[PDB]
Design a protein around this ligand. Structure first.
Ligand SMILES: *[C@@H]1O[C@H](CO)[C@@H](O[C@@H]2O[C@H](CO)[C@@H](O[C@@H]3O[C@H](CO[C@H]4O[C@H](CO[C@H]5O[C@H](CO)[C@@H](O)[C@H](O)[C@@H]5O[C@H]5O[C@H](CO)[C@@H](O)[C@H](O)[C@@H]5O)[C@@H](O)[C@H](O[C@H]5O[C@H](CO)[C@@H](O)[C@H](O)[C@@H]5O)[C@@H]4O)[C@@H](O)[C@H](O[C@H]4O[C@H](CO)[C@@H](O)[C@H](O)[C@@H]4O[C@H]4O[C@H](CO)[C@@H](O)[C@H](O)[C@@H]4O[C@H]4O[C@H](CO)[C@@H](O)[C@H](O)[C@@H]4O)[C@@H]3O)[C@H](O)[C@H]2NC(C)=O)[C@H](O)[C@H]1NC(C)=O
Ligand SMILES: *[C@@H]1O[C@H](CO)[C@@H](O)[C@H](O)[C@H]1NC(C)=O
Ligand SMILES: *[C@@H]1O[C@H](CO)[C@@H](O)[C@H](O)[C@H]1NC(C)=O
Ligand SMILES: *[C@@H]1O[C@H](CO)[C@@H](O)[C@H](O)[C@H]1NC(C)=O
Ligand SMILES: *[C@@H]1O[C@H](CO)[C@@H](O)[C@H](O)[C@H]1NC(C)=O
Ligand SMILES: *[C@@H]1O[C@H](CO)[C@@H](O)[C@H](O)[C@H]1NC(C)=O
Ligand SMILES: *[C@@H]1O[C@H](CO)[C@@H](O)[C@H](O)[C@H]1NC(C)=O
Ligand SMILES: *[C@@H]1O[C@H](CO)[C@@H](O)[C@H](O)[C@H]1NC(C)=O
Ligand SMILES: *[C@@H]1O[C@H](CO)[C@@H](O)[C@H](O)[C@H]1NC(C)=O
Ligand SMILES: [Cl-]
Lengths: 175, 210, 303, 228
């Protein structure tokens, strides 16, 4: 029931821990029961998932019963429910990955309008709140717009994406 | 290039390939008698083409580090030649050079006294205002012969040109001396003698105008 | 109530081989904590001698005799002997080597067939010869590629058997053999030990086929003799504990070793992708599975 | 198969050399062919070779001044050498080349190498780089004297450049014993050789002896007769 958010292109560590403080067989699978990554003996196995070349672990911690799944350069398609079967228990995590791109000309001349959009996974019902340099707010369920652009709005915008009572922050530099 | 080796007639000669082999090899041995075309003695490592005696032998590439060597057991006088070893191994690449040639000298053959023929200025020749005489030394060994023209018992003062003995198809030396005269000079004397000398031993031949 | 998957002899066995690999094959460097342990490493030649598990008096091992035994069932015929048979503990990543042959028909064993993350152990009708060498002494002389030779024919016949036994357990779905999805070089590749050299060999050639029935298969055709290429390492990943280790080279010369292939270690992909097909790849690395492969017919009880 | 070469014998100092080879018996399209020279005081130098499938390979040393070609119809090999110099004066040989393979390891891993050996050779043709005037010989006969029963007669070929001259007897009839001689070089810088043959004196008068002098660089041909 854990819910971890993640920015696009970021890295996440989905944690997993054992009762014993020694290394033992653990497997990370996704919702469709596709093997993401595991350990055989002291060896890392990588399943045939989509995460394959971006999935990894941290084996230095295995010895104390700690088997994190690390996913690097996040993608929206990575949004899923991951399970860590170790020691006959099934830890569940849900990873939600969001993007918030501006796709701007890099030259919003005065009176021009943003231009702020959100990339979101299936099932998600994300709320977006964007705060301007000055303190102006804009609210967007899936998209964000400034009705008129003035010289005050230029600078660094702070956007918070809320999802399952947890939050995440994108900052964007605009002119 | 042209490193020299000398062997006793009848004894065995062992020519070692001048380039070491880096890994597995295929060595060719060619025999070459200058003026003539070379001859393939050994290909693969120890394989022989037809016509090549079993007395020529290469060294097979069976064990590590074995030196490539041509062996000529019971050398004969017709084994004097340059010997090339064309090395090919797996470590260097394409072999573009035959390399240095070992020059075999066979010691020392049996003595042979020269075989002399002398020839008076021919008809056509004499007619065309030019008179030359042809002393033909032949079948000798060692190949060192001194030639002096008798000129009717007075040594000739000019017009002599002698070759330097060059070996022949029969493994013995041949040479050639040419006295050259004006037809008047030929008739002006009764006899003409060329003496050749070989190991302090002279043989003389004479001709006269007719 | 036998249970090869929760046997305790297997853990003792494991600890035995670990201790046998100390002394027998000492690594110059281990890297762990990092702890960075160093130890003098004389060049050595290694060949595992057999091991027996022994029962302390007042305890005993029962030997099941079912010529075909899955390993997790009540055993009908049961015997009682003092020590297990002699078992030469080859540590090998992908193919089980020199293990005892299954009596009668081929056997496949899982603790759970259905969990795609549980390893299937395979025991063979008859053994397949595999020959491996690292010819070029070590580069002086000829540059030669370390390699392994297997018979295409015998491998194909063995595959045919493995397919009949798998299809039984999997409802007759066409079964596909492919290479390791991901992993350390040890488990991606057929990693083993020949004459104290640490071979990594490429088995993809071994597992490139589609079998619909026990006949009607794809990709299995080829040259008479399968030649697996190998790399040979000295700084390797440890099987005994999570770390890296550097070993010594061996007493010089050609390494040549022929090993019976008596077993396989497969895992299947599964998951909800369907396609009415099953995909099997080679695996291993938990050497316990290697010992399990031998001790499935043994269990310790108090007396 | 049999090989016979030919060439100019003389080549001017900036020009291009061209020599050729005629094969007999087999077809020129079934064999690797190769040229090899032999400069004076220098060892055998390998010029390059052309394959059965007519690809070519030249020795780096010749700086790509070399063209080896195959004329299937005329059934001939030719080798041309650009921009020649005094160091190009040599006896050019063409020869069969045979490609052996020395296999030491697993063939799939490319654990082997190709080598080449020359079994069949040409007689070879001598070429001299020179600005010098070419010149044919005037042969006169050397009449027998009148030991028994043999008597010796011959030809005298005087003032021909450059070497070599070939002497035959009665076309090719008289093989034994004809003994042609090493030529002599005069202060004039022209060669003059001679050629004798021992033969029965009981054969004099009746059996007619003619010598055949071939001087390819000229290209003079000449027969003369020898009578008592
Ligand atoms: C895993 O599986 C892999 C796949 O199977 C496997 O790969 C194999 O590995 C081994 C090594 O591990 C390799 O073995 C070597 O094999 C070479 C090739 O062998 C074959 O070919 C040669 C030559 O064949 C041509 O020439 C002969 C000779 O005239 C002709 O008769 C033939 O017609 C043929 O000519 C035609 O084809 C040519 C192309 O090659 C053309 O050029 C030509 O125009 C023609 O068309 C044969 O001689 C071999 O047959 C003899 O041996 C085979 C078995 O190899 C026998 O079955 C057969 O009865 C014969 O006895 C064969 O067919 C070898 O050349 C090579 O061994 C040489 O080198 C090593 C080290 O360099 C030496 O130790 C060894 O002694 C050999 O050197 C001798 O021979 C060479 C060449 O003649 C000489 O140059 C050298 O001086 C030396 O001569 C001495 O010994 C000679 C014979 O021993 C003797 O004749 C001389 O008089 C002298 O005493 C070595 O054997 C093998 O190539 C791989 N194979 C493949 C297909 O990949 C791998 O090993 C496996 N490993 C595992 C996992 O265990
Ligand atoms: C390999 O199997 C054969 C039976 O085919 C057997 O005779 C031999 O002892 C086995 N080798 C080892 C090392 O167990
Ligand atoms: C086999 O694995 C599946 C994986 O979810 C599990 O549901 C089932 O209980 C396992 N079978 C057993 C433990 O006998
Ligand atoms: C492997 O080696 C054994 C023993 O040398 C031999 O009997 C078997 O034929 C070989 N198998 C191959 C080369 O596939
Ligand atoms: C396995 O390979 C052998 C040898 O090339 C071949 O004859 C056979 O058809 C193959 N086995 C199959 C297709 O089951
Ligand atoms: C070896 O494995 C590589 C991938 O690691 C694969 O692409 C290749 O086909 C394999 N080669 C052989 C000979 O098995
Ligand atoms: C597997 O089969 C394909 C053809 O289906 C072939 O091209 C490929 O090289 C094979 N892989 C190996 C390792 O031989
Ligand atoms: C199996 O035993 C054989 C024969 O005794 C030996 O050559 C080989 O090293 C063993 N296999 C291993 C250690 O993988
Ligand atoms: C199959 O054999 C051919 C020659 O018959 C060879 O070129 C190729 O390398 C072989 N393939 C493999 C995977 O050994
Ligand atoms: Cl070998």
């Amino acid at each position: 029931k854990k819910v971890v958010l993640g920015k696009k292109g970021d890295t996440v560590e989905l944690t997993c821990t054992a009762s014993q403080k020694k290394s033992i067989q653990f497997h990370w699978k996704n919702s469709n029961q596709i093997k993401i990554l595991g350990n055989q003996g002291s060896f890392l196995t990588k399943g045939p998932s989509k995460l394959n070349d971006r999935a990894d672990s941290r084996r230095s911690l295995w010895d104390q019963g700690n088997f994190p799944l690390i996913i690097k350069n996040l993608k929206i398609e990575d949004s899923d429910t991951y399970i860590c079967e170790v020691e006959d228990q099934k830890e569940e995590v849900q990873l939600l990955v969001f993007g918030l791109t501006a796709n701007s000309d890099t030259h919003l001349l005065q009176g021009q309008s943003l231009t702020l959009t959100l990339e979101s996974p299936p099932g998600s019902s994300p709320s977006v709140q964007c705060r301007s340099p000055r303190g102006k707010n804009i609210q967007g369920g899936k998209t964000l717009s400034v009705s008129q652009l003035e010289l005050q709005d230029s600078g660094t915008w702070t956007c918070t994406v809320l999802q399952n009572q947890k939050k995440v922050e994108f900052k964007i530099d605009i002119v | 290039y042209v490193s020299p080796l000398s062997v006793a007639l009848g004894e065995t000669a062992r020519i070692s390939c001048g380039r070491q082999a880096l890994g597995s090899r295929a060595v060719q041995w060619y025999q070459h008698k200058p003026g003539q075309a070379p001859i393939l003695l050994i290909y693969n490592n120890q394989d022989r083409p037809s016509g090549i005696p079993e007395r020529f032998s290469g060294t097979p590439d069976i064990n590590f580090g074995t030196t490539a060597t041509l062996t000529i057991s019971g050398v004969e006088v017709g084994d004097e030649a340059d010997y090339y070893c064309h090395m090919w191994d797996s470590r260097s690449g394409f072999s573009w050079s035959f390399g240095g040639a070992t020059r075999l000298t066979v010691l020392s053959q049996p003595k042979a006294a020269p075989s002399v023929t002398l020839f008076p200025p021919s008809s056509e020749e004499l007619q065309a205002n030019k008179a030359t005489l042809v002393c033909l030394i032949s079948d000798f060994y060692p190949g060192a012969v001194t030639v002096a023209w008798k000129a009717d018992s007075s040594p000739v003062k000019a017009g002599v040109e002698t070759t330097t003995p060059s070996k022949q198809s029969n493994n013995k030396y041949a040479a050639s001396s040419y006295l050259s005269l004006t037809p008047e000079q030929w008739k002006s004397h009764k006899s003409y003698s060329c003496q050749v000398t070989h190991e302090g031993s002279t043989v003389e031949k004479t001709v006269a105008p007719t | 109530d036998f249970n090869m998957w929760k046997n305790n002899m297997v853990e003792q066995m494991q600890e035995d081989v670990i201790n046998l690999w100390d002394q027998s094959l000492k690594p110059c460097v281990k890297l762990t904590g990092g702890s960075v342990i160093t130890q003098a490493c004389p060049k050595v030649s290694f060949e595992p001698i057999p091991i027996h598990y022994c029962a302390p008096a007042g305890f005993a091992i029962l030997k099941c005799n079912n010529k075909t035994f899955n390993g997790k069932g009540q055993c009908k015929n049961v015997s009682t002997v003092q020590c297990t048979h002699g078992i030469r503990p080859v540590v090998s990543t992908q193919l089980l080597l020199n293990g005892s042959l299954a009596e009668e028909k081929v056997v496949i064993r899982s603790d759970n067939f259905t969990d795609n993350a549980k390893t299937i152990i395979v025991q063979l009708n008859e053994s397949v010869k595999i020959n491996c060498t690292r010819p070029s002494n070590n580069i002086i002389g000829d540059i030669r590629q370390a390699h392994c030779n297997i018979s295409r024919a015998q491998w194909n016949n063995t595959l045919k058997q493995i397919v009949e036994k798998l299809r039984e357990q999997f409802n007759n779905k066409t079964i596909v053999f492919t290479h390791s999805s991901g992993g350390d070089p040890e488990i991606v590749m057929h990693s083993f030990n020949c004459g104290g050299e640490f071979f990594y060999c490429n088995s993809t050639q071994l597992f490139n086929s589609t079998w619909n029935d026990t006949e009607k298969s794809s990709g299995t055709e080829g040259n008479d003799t399968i030649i697996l290429p190998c790399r040979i390492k000295q700084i390797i990943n440890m099987w005994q504990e999570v770390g890296k280790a550097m070993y010594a080279p061996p007493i010089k010369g050609q390494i040549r070793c022929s090993s019976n292939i008596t077993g396989l270690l497969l895992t299947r992909d599964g998951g909800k992708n369907e396609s009415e097909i099953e995909i099997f790849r080679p695996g291993g690395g938990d050497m316990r599975d290697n010992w399990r492969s031998e001790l499935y017919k043994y269990k310790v009880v108090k007396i | 198969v049999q090989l016979q070469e030919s060439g100019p014998g003389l080549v001017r100092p900036s020009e291009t050399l061209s020599v050729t080879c005629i094969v007999s018996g087999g077809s020129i399209s079934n064999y690797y062919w190769t040229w090899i020279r032999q400069s004076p005081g220098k060892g055998l130098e390998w010029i390059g070779y052309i394959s059965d499938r007519e690809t070519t390979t030249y020795n780096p040393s010749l700086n790509s001044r070399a063209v080896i070609s195959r004329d299937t119809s005329k059934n001939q090999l030719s080798l041309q050498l650009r921009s020649v110099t005094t160091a190009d004066t040599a006896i050019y040989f063409c020869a069969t080349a045979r490609r052996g393979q020395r296999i030491y390891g697993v063939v799939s891993f490319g654990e082997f190498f190709y080598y080449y050996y020359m079994d069949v050779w040409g007689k070879g043709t001598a070429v001299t780089v020179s600005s010098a005037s070419t010149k044919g010989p005037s042969v006169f006969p050397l009449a027998p004297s009148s030991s028994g029963g043999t008597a010796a007669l011959g030809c005298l070929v005087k003032d021909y450049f450059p070497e070599p001259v070939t002497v035959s007897w009665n076309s090719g009839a008289l093989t034994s014993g004809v003994h042609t001689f090493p030529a002599v070089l005069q202060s004039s810088g022209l060669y003059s050789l001679s050629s004798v043959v021992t033969v029965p004196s009981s054969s004099l008068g009746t059996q007619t002896y003619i010598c055949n002098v071939n001087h390819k660089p000229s290209n003079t041909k000449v027969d003369k007769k020898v009578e008592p």
